[PDB]
Amino acid sequence: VHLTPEEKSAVTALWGKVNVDEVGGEALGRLLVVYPWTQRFFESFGDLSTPDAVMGNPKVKAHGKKVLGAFSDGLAHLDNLKGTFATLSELHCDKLHVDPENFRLLGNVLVCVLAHHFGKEFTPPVQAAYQKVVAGVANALAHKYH
Amino acid sequence: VHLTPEEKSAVTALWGKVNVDEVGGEALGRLLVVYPWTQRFFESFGDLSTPDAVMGNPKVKAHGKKVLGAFSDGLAHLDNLKGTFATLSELHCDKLHVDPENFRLLGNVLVCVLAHHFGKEFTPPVQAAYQKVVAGVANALAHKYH
Amino acid sequence: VLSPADKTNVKAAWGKVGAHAGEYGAEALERMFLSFPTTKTYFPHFDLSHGSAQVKGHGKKVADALTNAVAHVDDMPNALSALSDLHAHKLRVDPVNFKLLSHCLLVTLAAHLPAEFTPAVHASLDKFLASVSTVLTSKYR
Amino acid sequence: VLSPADKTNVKAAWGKVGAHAGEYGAEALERMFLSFPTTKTYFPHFDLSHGSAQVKGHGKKVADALTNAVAHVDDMPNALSALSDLHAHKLRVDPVNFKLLSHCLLVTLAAHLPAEFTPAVHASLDKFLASVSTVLTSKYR
Numbered sequence: 001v002h003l004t005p006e007e008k009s010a011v012t013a014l015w016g017k018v019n020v021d022e023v024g025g026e027a028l029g030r031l032l033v034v035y036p037w038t039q040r041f042f043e044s045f046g047d048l049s050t051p052d053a054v055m056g057n058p059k060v061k062a063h064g065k066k067v068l069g070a071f072s073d074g075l076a077h078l079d080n081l082k083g084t085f086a087t088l089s090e091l092h093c094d095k096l097h098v099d100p101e102n103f104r105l106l107g108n109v110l111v112c113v114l115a116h117h118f119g120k121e122f123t124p125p126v127q128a129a130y131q132k133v134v135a136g137v138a139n140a141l142a143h144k145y146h
Numbered sequence: 147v148h149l150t151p152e153e154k155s156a157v158t159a160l161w162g163k164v165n166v167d168e169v170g171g172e173a174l175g176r177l178l179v180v181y182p183w184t185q186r187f188f189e190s191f192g193d194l195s196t197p198d199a200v201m202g203n204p205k206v207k208a209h210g211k212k213v214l215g216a217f218s219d220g221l222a223h224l225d226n227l228k229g230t231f232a233t234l235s236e237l238h239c240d241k242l243h244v245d246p247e248n249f250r251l252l253g254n255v256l257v258c259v260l261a262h263h264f265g266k267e268f269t270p271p272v273q274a275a276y277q278k279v280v281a282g283v284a285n286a287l288a289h290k291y292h
Numbered sequence: 293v294l295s296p297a298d299k300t301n302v303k304a305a306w307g308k309v310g311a312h313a314g315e316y317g318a319e320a321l322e323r324m325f326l327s328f329p330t331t332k333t334y335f336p337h338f339d340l341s342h343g344s345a346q347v348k349g350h351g352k353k354v355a356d357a358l359t360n361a362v363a364h365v366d367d368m369p370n371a372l373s374a375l376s377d378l379h380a381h382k383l384r385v386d387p388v389n390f391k392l393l394s395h396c397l398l399v400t401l402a403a404h405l406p407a408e409f410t411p412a413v414h415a416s417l418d419k420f421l422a423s424v425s426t427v428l429t430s431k432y433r
Numbered sequence: 434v435l436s437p438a439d440k441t442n443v444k445a446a447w448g449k450v451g452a453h454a455g456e457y458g459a460e461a462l463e464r465m466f467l468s469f470p471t472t473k474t475y476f477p478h479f480d481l482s483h484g485s486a487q488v489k490g491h492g493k494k495v496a497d498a499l500t501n502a503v504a505h506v507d508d509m510p511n512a513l514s515a516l517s518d519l520h521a522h523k524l525r526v527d528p529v530n531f532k533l534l535s536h537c538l539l540v541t542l543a544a545h546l547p548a549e550f551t552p553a554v555h556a557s558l559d560k561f562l563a564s565v566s567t568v569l570t571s572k573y574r
């Protein structure tokens with residue numbers, strides 16, 4: 001919650017330059033490399049035995065697309081993230097049994113990926129705006145757990 | 147956080163049996179004993195050199211009572227904790243410079259103190275309701291930070 | 293680091309618990325599932341119905357591991373080596389949940405040990421449970 | 434624990450940072466203050482806005498401490514002993530803030546080291562910063 005109009009424009013401007021499919025695969029991959037206990041949810045994805053095995057894993061990449069696709073759609077609804085992600089929250093709780101702490105981990109890995117891709121363009125104020133976003137999305141995905 | 151009508155009743159009923167002087171002194175005291183780095187905020191309170199010194203400190207006891215009074219006022223505002231603690235939030239941020247993580251620690255300790263006093267009466271469902279409350283109060287006190 | 297005074301407090305407190313350890317472990321789990329529902333995401337394969345025998349059985353396992361850790365408080369990394377292996381390679385519970393269970397164990401102890409749960413013992417028990425948690429997550433990556 | 438590959442990765446990445454260590458330390462701090470305003474509660478005596486002489490000076494201190502940790506990567510509890518004393522007895526920063534600064538250091542490194550900040554190196558740096566953080570909070574109680 002509580003992005004400024006200048007921050008909303010900054011978020012939107014940067015995201016227009018984002019290849020969502022590519023960044024999604026990269027973010028999910030890095031999540032599984034940097035925090036390898038998160039691999040617990042993806043046993044069916046096959047080989048996750050090395051950083052390269054994870055990052056280049058086609059099922060990881062594919063999944064990253066749909067994950068960041070949903071993230072991308074949520075950027076159009078920054079004033080109602082809880083509503084936006086309510087059904088995905090319920091699904092991740094009731095069907096997938098995913099600890100919402102994982103959403104926080106993914107959020108910060110995503111921020112690292114954005115910094116890596118954009119370099120100096122990912123300025124401290126732009127980061128700050130995106131930290132508000134990933135916190136809001138994680139909080140929204142956590143909101144319907146019970 | 148959203149308490150159920152059944153939990154609101156449980157919270158209010160237990161609180162009606164709470165000795166604020168004892169529980170307040172015990173909660174603030176144990177914060178300073180169990181997480182002694184939090185003493186950084188209370189050097190003006192004088193002797194905090196031993197557990198007995200902390201628990202018996204007149205200023206610790208007086209302040210604990212005052213803190214619990216604010217907590218009590220929040221319990222009469224459960225549907226709008228952010229509103230009722232908005233003023234205290236700004237104060238702790240701008241005037242007191244207190245890291246809001248400490249609010250969670252105090253909530254932890256308060257729940258332990260309630261359990262210590264009430265014993266088996268502090269049932270798991272009663273605890274669950276009070277965890278919603280202390281999370282709600284901590285979040286509300288953190289909300290106006292900037 | 294657990295001070296010698298910490299170890300004295302932990303041994304004395306857990307000694308008082310005694311044969312109630314299994315019961316208190318189950319109670320702590322129940323308190324955790326109710327207070328912190330996200331922790332249930334690690335038990336979808338469990339029967340979580342009220343009074344669940346499966347939860348009580350798990351409470352016993354958790355308590356027994358803690359009893360062993362108290363008995364080997366000077367060398368917990370070695371004592372809990374196999375358990376730490378299991379947590380890192382199989383269970384893979386996010387580290388944040390260990391603080392939630394630890395808090396619920398403290399609450400359970402507080403509710404059952406009115407005389408023993410002094411501020412100093414409270415502090416020692418918290419350090420102890422944090423130390424056990426550190427060992428159990430020590431091989432995660 | 435840091436693996437042989439972790440230490441190779443950390444030494445290579447921080448070595449590449451090179452003379453920029455101080456600059457990057459200051460940038461990481463600024464990123465932290467802007468992204469996580471609660472961290473500002475530890476610096477009420479500081480100008481925290483961009484171009485702060487105090488933040489630049491403090492960034493150099495933080496960076497130099499990390500450089501020393503890298504040089505003594507197999508003995509960080511002792512190499513950082515004086516600093517961990519200061520954190521435990523004076524600074525008394527809540528442990529969560531170390532994760533916030535560590536994240537901002539990773540972001541800073543990612544923004545400056547396109548070729549070097551691979552997934553494996555990212556993983557190693559995160560472990561390293563977590564290990565430094567653990568040392569600096571090890572004497573709190």
Ligand code: HEM
Binds near residue numbers: 068070088
């Ligand atoms: C920005 C955060 C996230 C978003 C927006 C998101 C979104 C989605 C979507 C749209 C699906 C497909 C839903 C369906 O199958 O009906 C999904 C599935 C799934 N998600 Fe998430 N997700 C997020 C984070 C995570 C994280 C961090 C994890 C675990 C580390 C996770 C675990 C899973 C799993 C296991 C599935 C099912 C995969 C399968 O089909 O085998 N998600 N997610």
Ligand code: HEM
Binds near residue numbers: 212213217284
């Ligand atoms: C979590 C619930 C808390 C509540 C409801 C609360 C409430 C209050 C209230 C009512 C005051 C007095 C305000 C005034 O003088 O006008 C106060 C002061 C203060 N609070 Fe809190 N507080 C909480 C937590 C904390 C924590 C966890 C810390 C530090 C670890 C803290 C640090 C302080 C300090 C340093 C003061 C000023 C003490 C003095 O006068 O020297 N508070 N608080």
Ligand code: HNI
Binds near residue numbers: 350353385
């Ligand atoms: C919130 C999740 C969670 C936490 C915080 C946690 C924290 C702890 C702590 C901390 C003090 C201890 C001592 C402990 C001990 C144990 N756990 Ni935990 N465990 C947790 C979720 C599990 C799960 C899940 C299993 C597997 C249970 C099963 O039977 O499938 C488990 C299994 C065990 C076992 C059984 C091992 C075996 O089968 O050989 C022991 C013993 N543990 N767990």
Ligand code: HNI
Binds near residue numbers: 516519524562
């Ligand atoms: C959010 C708060 C915070 C964090 C996360 C943090 C994390 C870290 C980390 C983590 C990797 C390192 C290596 C580090 C190193 C240092 N800090 Ni930190 N410090 C923090 C708040 C401080 C403060 C406050 C000071 C005192 C600054 C001053 O000038 O008063 C400080 C001072 C220092 C000094 C100077 C010591 C001296 O004067 O002798 C060093 C070195 N540090 N700090």
